[PDB]
Amino acid sequence: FQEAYPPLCSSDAAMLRTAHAGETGADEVHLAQYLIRDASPLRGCLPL
Amino acid sequence: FQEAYPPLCSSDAAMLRTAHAGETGADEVHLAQYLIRDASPLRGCLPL
Amino acid sequence: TQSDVAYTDRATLNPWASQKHSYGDRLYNGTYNLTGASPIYSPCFKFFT
Amino acid sequence: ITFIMPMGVFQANSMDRYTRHAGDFSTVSEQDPRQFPPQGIFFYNKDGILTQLTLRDAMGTICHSSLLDVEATLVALRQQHLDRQCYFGVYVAEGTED
Amino acid sequence: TFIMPMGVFQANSMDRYTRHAGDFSTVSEQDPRQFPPQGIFFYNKDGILTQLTLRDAMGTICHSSLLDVEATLVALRQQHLDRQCYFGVYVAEGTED
Amino acid sequence: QASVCEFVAMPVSTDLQYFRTACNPRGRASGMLYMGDRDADIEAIMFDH
């Protein structure tokens, strides 16, 4: 099938950690430091 | 005869994407741009 | 000269308590037996010996 | 089916200077590109992740021929009597021997 | 395959957009929070992050042994360009002028 | 266990909707699937044009 998609990502001083554990707050851009959200296997794997 | 179908928009979609996929942008508008929307058939299929 | 086996990005988080004879190791490692006469249990004794 | 479609549109009736929740597309300073016209055309194609249409083409396109147009259209409406209208002034001349 | 990008800063200036507020900038007066991205604090199995920030320069880019220019332009001496040309080209030695 | 990375120097500013559309690195078609509309010139689709 020849490809690869991008993820539910995280980790800035503005966007790194879990405090919340599930699916968190929800910004979707601000200027020029990013995060990234999911596109593949699991709408629900990674719980800490 | 005469009349018309549609879907849901946002043009500065700097009124388009923060984190949802569901029912998100509906108050028509944010600063000076043009934020079209939604009235042909299918509501809520096929997540983004 | 080699790996931190846990977090393989660096040698060791703090270079003050991880070398052969660093301050941390000279203070708590049971082999040197610095705190033998102290009757107080040392909670980090098991992490260094 | 058919539909129709768009580039940025504008309103007219001067009735919309409102507000709801805010500190806006504005910085320490005043007026670079924000009190201004929208952007345009883009899209969002097959299965979940949107697409551009900003600034590139109408030039294979209206250098076009059937617009200067005068034979057959006016032709197809020849023969009446043209509604109340006279000069306001259109004729012309050459000096005035004065 | 999933495939992970890691280097740029967009020289935008197109798509300003946003989700959060005035809750926020950093501590004092002037508002630059304009960091684009450098390399990567990342996790592992069961508690622990490691970091693909980069800090040996030391993957790929510059490399040399494309010190090697007879074969690919073995796709550049048997197909054909568009001519650029012949006063197209001048800085040299004299004519007693 | 083992892992190995394949980077190729990606882009500052025209696009984050192909950072929104996703994929294999390689980028635009070579592959194999839909065949037929002529076959034997195995030199000129990702080697000519």
Query: Residues A7, A43: contact at Cβ < 8 Å?
Result: no
Q: Rounded CA gap, E51 and C7, in Å?
A: 9
CB contact under 8 A, B14 and E17: yes
Query: Residues E17, A30: contact at Cβ < 8 Å?
Result: yes
Site from A1, A2, A5 to mutate, F interface, most F CB atoms within 10 angstroms: A2
Q: Rounded CA gap, E20 and D20, in Å?
A: 15
User: Touching check for F36 and chain E: CB below 8 Å?
Assistant: no
CB contact under 8 A, C8 and E50: yes
Query: Residues B19, A36: contact at Cβ < 8 Å?
Result: no
* First and final C-alpha spacing in chain D: 70
Give the count of Cβ contacts less than 8 A between chain A and E. 47
Q: Helix count (H) and strand count (E) of chain B?
A: 0, 0
Q: Rounded CA gap, D83 and D75, in Å?
A: 17
Which one, of C2, C9, A19, lies nearest residue E40 by Cα? C9
D-chain residues near B17 (CB < 8 A): 50
Nearest CA of chain C to the CA of E75: how many Å? 43
User: How buried is residue C25: exposed, middle or buried, by Cβ count under 10 Å (0-12/13-18/19+)?
Assistant: middle
Cβ neighbours of B14 (radius 10 Å) = 19
Query: Residues C7, C14: contact at Cβ < 8 Å?
Result: no
CB contact under 8 A, E15 and B18: no
Mapping DSSP onto H, E and C, the string for F3-42 reads CCCCCCCCCCCCCCCCCCCCCCCCCCCCCCCCCCCCCCCC
D-chain residues near E30 (CB < 8 A): 28
Residue type, B35: L
Residues whose CB is less than 8 angstroms from the CB of residue D35 and which lie 6 or more positions away in sequence, other chains included: B32
User: Touching check for F24 and chain A: CB below 8 Å?
Assistant: yes
Residues whose CB is less than 8 angstroms from the CB of residue D10 and which lie 6 or more positions away in sequence, other chains included: B34
Q: Which of F19, F26, F31 sits opposite A6 (nearest CB)?
A: F19
User: How buried is residue F29: exposed, middle or buried, by Cβ count under 10 Å (0-12/13-18/19+)?
Assistant: exposed
Neighbours of chain B (3+ CB pairs under 8 A): A, D, E
Residues whose CB is less than 8 angstroms from the CB of residue D27 and which lie 6 or more positions away in sequence, other chains included: E31
Nearest CA of chain B to the CA of E14: how many Å? 10
Nearest CA of chain F to the CA of E93: how many Å? 41
Nearest CA of chain D to the CA of E3: how many Å? 16
Q: Which of D23, D27, D28 sits opposite E21 (nearest CB)?
A: D23
Exp. method: cryo-EM
Q: Rounded CA gap, B9 and B15, in Å?
A: 9
D-chain residues near B16 (CB < 8 A): 50
Nearest CA of chain D to the CA of F23: how many Å? 12
User: Touching check for D51 and chain E: CB below 8 Å?
Assistant: no
E-chain residues near A31 (CB < 8 A): 16, 33-34
* H or E stretch covering D74: helix D72-76
